[PDB]
Design a protein around this ligand. Sequence first.
Ligand SMILES: Cc1cc(CCCOc2c(C)cc(-c3noc(C(F)(F)F)n3)cc2C)on1
Ligand SMILES: Cc1cc(CCCOc2c(C)cc(-c3noc(C(F)(F)F)n3)cc2C)on1
Lengths: 255, 236, 59, 59, 273, 273, 57, 40, 40, 40
Amino acid sequence: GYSDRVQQITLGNSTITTQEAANAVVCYAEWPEYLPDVDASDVNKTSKPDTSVCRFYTLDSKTWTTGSKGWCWKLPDALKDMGVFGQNMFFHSLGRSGYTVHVQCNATKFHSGCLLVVVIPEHQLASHEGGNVSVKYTFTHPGERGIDLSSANEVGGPVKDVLYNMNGTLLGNLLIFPHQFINLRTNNTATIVIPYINSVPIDSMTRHNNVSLMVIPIAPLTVPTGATPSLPITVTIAPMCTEFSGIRSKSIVPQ
Amino acid sequence: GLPTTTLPGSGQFLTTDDRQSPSALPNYEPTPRIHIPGKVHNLLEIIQVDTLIPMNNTHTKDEVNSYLIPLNANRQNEQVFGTNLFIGDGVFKTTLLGEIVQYYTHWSGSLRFSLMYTGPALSSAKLILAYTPPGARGPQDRREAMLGTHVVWDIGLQSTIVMTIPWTSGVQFRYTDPDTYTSAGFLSCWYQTSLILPPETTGQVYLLSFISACPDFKLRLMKDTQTISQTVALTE
Amino acid sequence: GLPTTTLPGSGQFLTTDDRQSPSALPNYEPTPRIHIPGKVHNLLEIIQVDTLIPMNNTH
Amino acid sequence: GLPTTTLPGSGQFLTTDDRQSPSALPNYEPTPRIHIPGKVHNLLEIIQVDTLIPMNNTH
Amino acid sequence: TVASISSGPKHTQKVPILTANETGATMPVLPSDSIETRTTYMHFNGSETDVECFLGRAACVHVTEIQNKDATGIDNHREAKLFNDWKINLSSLVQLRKKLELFTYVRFDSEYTILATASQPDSANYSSNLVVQAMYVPPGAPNPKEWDDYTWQSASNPSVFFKVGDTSRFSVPYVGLASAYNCFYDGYSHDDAETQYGITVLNHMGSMAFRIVNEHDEHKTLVKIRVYHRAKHVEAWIPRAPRALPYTSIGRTNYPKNTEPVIKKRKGDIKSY
Amino acid sequence: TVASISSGPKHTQKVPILTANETGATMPVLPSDSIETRTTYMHFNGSETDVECFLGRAACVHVTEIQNKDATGIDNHREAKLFNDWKINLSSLVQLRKKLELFTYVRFDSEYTILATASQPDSANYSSNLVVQAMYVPPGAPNPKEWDDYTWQSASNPSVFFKVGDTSRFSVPYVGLASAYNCFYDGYSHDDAETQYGITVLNHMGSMAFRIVNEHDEHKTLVKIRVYHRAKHVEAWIPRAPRALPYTSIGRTNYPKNTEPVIKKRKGDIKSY
Amino acid sequence: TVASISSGPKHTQKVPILTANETGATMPVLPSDSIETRTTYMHFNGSETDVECFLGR
Amino acid sequence: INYYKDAASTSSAGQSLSMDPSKFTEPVKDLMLKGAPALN
Amino acid sequence: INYYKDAASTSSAGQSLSMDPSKFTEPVKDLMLKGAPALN
Amino acid sequence: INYYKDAASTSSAGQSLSMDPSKFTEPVKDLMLKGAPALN
Ligand SMILES: Cc1cc(CCCOc2c(C)cc(-c3noc(C(F)(F)F)n3)cc2C)on1
Ligand SMILES: Cc1cc(CCCOc2c(C)cc(-c3noc(C(F)(F)F)n3)cc2C)on1
């Protein structure tokens, strides 16, 4: 009696269960793996903390209301302060990792709503100022909090129009990227396994965000008559096949 | 000296020609290839991935709402939506399919049109999707639509219905650019029974529509698209 | 570089010449052929079919 | 006469191209090679020899 | 290769047309899964939609200008256009840019074609036979300062000399520092609060300088230079949403403020045909 | 191959020269069927009358014009001929048209040759070396509006750049949507009371735009462009009555009113030699 | 061709990184002689630095 | 020798060398023999 | 026949002829059979 | 294929592919082993 709906994911000393899943997506059908010799350039022996960093970290919950526009997190940024994973991030010159993203949101058979959960490799954001204005470091490194698409523009920050994916492309085409939907009537969780995707073997984990995770309401939230007009959304992420290289002083980053 | 005769066209620069040319960087050794997931070989590969259709054009500006097809409770016989099938224009123009299709002049094959219900689990409904092949008008009522290719969709556990728009044509290819002789027909949706909401539940439920190509698909005669332009060269 | 000598006529456009030329539409796949009755291969084929002579010009 | 079509780039002088060219001194016999120590084949050979770094710029 | 198989009536427990798009998958449903079909063949391979073909034709990537005129008394040759340069990039002219940006990473060899055309806006007794010199100035190479610098000696930099009115042609191997070129880059050059964002910091390919070798004539000649790029031996990874809004700058994904709706608005109902 | 066999006297019940043309057949009667003949050989294959040869030579199919001049203040470049375009079709110039129309359906690859010639009607100190750009604009591609639009970037549209006075040459594969091109079409684009009739609705091949890349000189230059078409790998079906009356329009079979008799009138009797 | 061999911890009497430059020699010391390394390949021949190429333009 | 990759770029086909006028000259249902009465 | 020493100078590669849309169309962990309930 | 009679007219030689830095890096009389004391 095994179902696409019931699943368990165990990484390190952390386990996740869901009784209302919709299968799981493995980006471009590729499971994360360590860096093979044939592709390596950096000559340093790498460090593989394994279970101390390859475990689930739960971010702060977001509140989905009738007016929510969506949220955007960036990796590895979002976990920059998570236990040993975070520490290794700043103590090493280079690093590479994959992840298992698990977005949670339950309601009742009376509610309705549909969230788009998508992973976008190299999600280079646009400046709301147009022209040739840049987007300052801090604004693409929100950390665990993430970027709230319904928040107002701010000097040095990115444009936050859900309709244009924060980058001049249409929302409807976000589906070309590995994604999954959390359709309250069907779902309650979305799971995406992300393999390391980059044009280099390994890379700086502080100055470059490999992918960004977006949770975007498409069909708006609807609650039954007289019910609390909101639902919480929780994001849990676990790094996997994490490798660190070039250990040293420990970066000091903007702000 | 080998005697030769130069032919017309000599000295011309055909942007489409594929010849050899001397390398300006002799002995340069390019960087090793490393494995990168998600390799794309053919555009026909990616148009088989469906994206959301902004079926609900009706708004004053681009909005998440243009992707939401409204469904109304306790309506019988009525029409939910309609559209012609010029995949290179209208609702389709901005979709991945429409976008890629516009890089070519001709298209052929079958389209995959899907509808995902997002209303509450305890609600129910039966809709009917219909494809009206060229030669007659877009259907004006369910009876008329029902006479052609269609699918009666029962909303339930499996949230999505996939209706195929089978390649129905005499000439084996059509123009991506809207052309009458080459029209693809019409697509419409109607209430088979009606949408029923459960107690303590109120308002509107929406449908999400998707479009993608079947392995049937063919695209040819590459050309520039009308989906991008500029007045002056961009600068840094 | 292969030494060559261009001959008179170079650069000319003889409407009757039959040479190769680059294709402006590389990789284009033309529509499949279907059977169509009445194929003509040579004009000598059709002149063997007789037609009416307007022998009575007089009008 | 072999029919040909000249391509874009004809007549250009790419300082980096490596072609054949007629010799202005036909039948000239260059001087014999003699052994000379210290032959260099690749620049990667000599950069492996270390030299002093003017680390104390300060002057 | 069959396009459609023969398929007749159906009455099963197997419902191929009922799926769950929230899984993130696009099930390969076929016409034969929902209607009765006959057998047909493809008679098609999809050659023209191969990425090698898609990016395999020349597209104009830059237009610039230089001019032949007396340099006597000119204090800034560069400004006077006695010679000009192009900070190499493929995102200045939008047509090719949108195509390349259909992917995230892209790797290929490049074939360049440079077309130079003359123009004499005011009184000239004849059109002069000018020779253009296009020199590649990689990062670190000395930039020309005067139209006749020692830099144009081009002892190590590669350069071509061709007639105006004519065309220049050569190919360049994949010169990226990484395994592929980035069309997008969600990062910076270092962890700094003010440094630039985007591929702007990645695509640092130096530039190529153009000049007219001839000394000046009595009249002034305006030479316009157009660079065309054709990719060959193509490899592309991670497809993405096509660009929808207009571009505003080289390298950034920025779009103009108060831009017009890109999705057409119906002249009527959602029920309209 | 014998042209005529040896045939002598005859006195039979077999009458080869008596037939019934109402059957619709043209019996293959030979000279040896009605007279005494000697043996002769063909010494002929009929190569020159093969449809491949008949349509296999270049014929001018269009003449157009563009000009190089100051565009300053010109509000409609197209009208000013700063650039011009040709709604591709092969029935504008009658010579090739009559040949093609000897058949109903026709299929072949095309070899185009574009000749551009300069002209300076009024005072000019020299003849300029202009470069022409011919770009193919398929249905759906953005049409150029100004002689220096972004459209001329031609990132996906194919185009050639060649010198005026020179010639352009390339071939195009059979691009019909059907299995063959229609020379005639007894139909419409849809069942509408006012829509157009004839191949006019079938031959929608887009158009090709021409322009001169160079900026303007002091004087004005008139460039005339002639397009030649040669068919190759020919296939033809359903022969028809040759055209008798003059043409009046592209695509239609219409003929002028009060047209002159095409059949010669005898200067005398029906008995006249 | 390997760029670097796999090399682990070390505690020897053999000190490759201690030399005497007054000999006039540049001992071919490698990264694997002073740090722990992983295996990597050259994927490079050095064509462009051959004297034939250096003076060949 | 063909210098280009596409078929469309090759030169002329060369004589079909088929030649069968009968589909136009004798498109009759019942075969008619020369010499035999056309209408029997 | 290639006239130049470097690979970069050769002409276009020719159709990849691989074509596997599944890494984009079906990037799911548990194989889903057409016809079988998507969510069992 | 070489079109000219003289050797001088042929194109570039192609990578020497010898590469021995030791005549410059280790021009010492007594071989010195990496790891062994430079001055014994
Ligand atoms: C993305 C992306 C990819 C690239 C490749 C740019 C290639 O850069 C060049 C160019 C444009 C020209 C030459 C070049 N070599 O010789 C000449 C000359 F003829 F122009 F001098 N130009 C060399 C390189 C490395 O740039 N952006
Ligand atoms: C009947 C009948 C048959 C045809 C074939 C028309 C072919 O259409 C073209 C033409 C005329 C030129 C090009 C073309 N490709 O490149 C160029 C350029 F060099 F002109 F730019 N022109 C491409 C097509 C599909 O048109 N009418």
